[PDB]
């Protein structure tokens, strides 16, 4: 019942992000250091320092769009995928998902077929057609089929509507996705597939209500590239990292 536990880990993790310390430790863009080595006091001091550099908070808003740099964040796609990837895969050696090796000319089916049946993997996807970054979680399930789940956030603006990571995880975080559809989505040929096929693959895999009327294929960059990278993880280490972060610490 790894699936049931996974669901609970993800749920308590997401609920804790209303907490200042949890939020800042989760959503930070330093990737060369261990996620769990992040100090929420120091992060807060770094923001204070930056705001001072800018001549105070009301000035800081003027020159950077109006954002209160102390506010808690809900992350854009690259930031959610990069950090949840580190959360899942790290133990005591830092991993920088921005620097790992990506595969550009491999089909997803080809790649998954090479993965150890007894290992958990997470795949980070950098999708140029969509302009989107997201994760595919492939936990090993005992006497069960190879099963895939999506983890993502999206501020919107492309083919897909906006979705917060918290909402995504709450509605679809334990919803298995077709490796078949994923293989089709992730192929080179995806750019040439009919409107209705593209719209339905997208809605089915990436839209929170699986609603094809919520998908705008006119925003696709049909010449965009697809790259992806996979990495094993220890399930208990994942739980352990998330518990720590949720510990409002």
Author numbering: 14 to 262
Article excerpt on this structure:
One family of T3S effectors, the Cifs, re-program the host cell cycle causing arrest at the G2/M or the G1/S transition. In this study the crystal structures of Cif from P. luminescences (CifPl) and B. pseudomallei (CifBp) are presented. The structures reveal a head-and-tail domain arrangement, with the head-domain adopting an overall fold similar to papain-like cysteine proteases. The structure of the tail-domain of CifPl and CifBp presents an extensive surface area adjacent to the active site suggestive of a binding surface for interaction with a specific substrate.
Limited protelysis of CifBp with trypsin identified a stable fragment with a molecular weight of ∼30 kDa, as determined from SDS-PAGE gels (not shown). MALDI-TOF analysis of this CifBp fragment is most consistent with digestion of the protein following Arg55 (PINNACLE Lab., Newcastle University). Therefore, CifBp may in fact start at Met61 and amino acid numbering in this study reflects this (i.e. the sequence numbering begins at M(1)ITPIISSNLG). Although it is expected that Cif proteins function as monomers in vivo, each of the Cifs produced in this study displays the properties of monomer-dimer equilibria in solution, with the exception of CifBp which purifies as a single species (whose apparent molecular weight suggests a dimeric form). The two chains of CifBp overlay with an rmsd of 0.42 Å (245 equivalent Cα atoms) and can therefore be considered essentially identical. The structure of CifBp determined here is virtually identical to that recently determined independently. The tail-domain of CifBp (back to residue 14) adopts a conformation very similar to that found in CifPl, even though there is very little sequence identity between these proteins in this region. The structure of CifPl overlays on CifBp with rmsds of 1.24 Å (chain A, 226 equivalent Cα atoms) and 1.25 Å (chain B, 226 equivalent Cα atoms). CifPl and CifBp overlay on the structure of CifEc (chain A) with an rmsd of 1.33 Å and 1.20 Å respectively (145 and 151 equivalent Cα atoms). The structures presented here show that the conformation of the occluding loop is conserved in both CifPl (residues 203–212) and CifBp (residues 168–177).
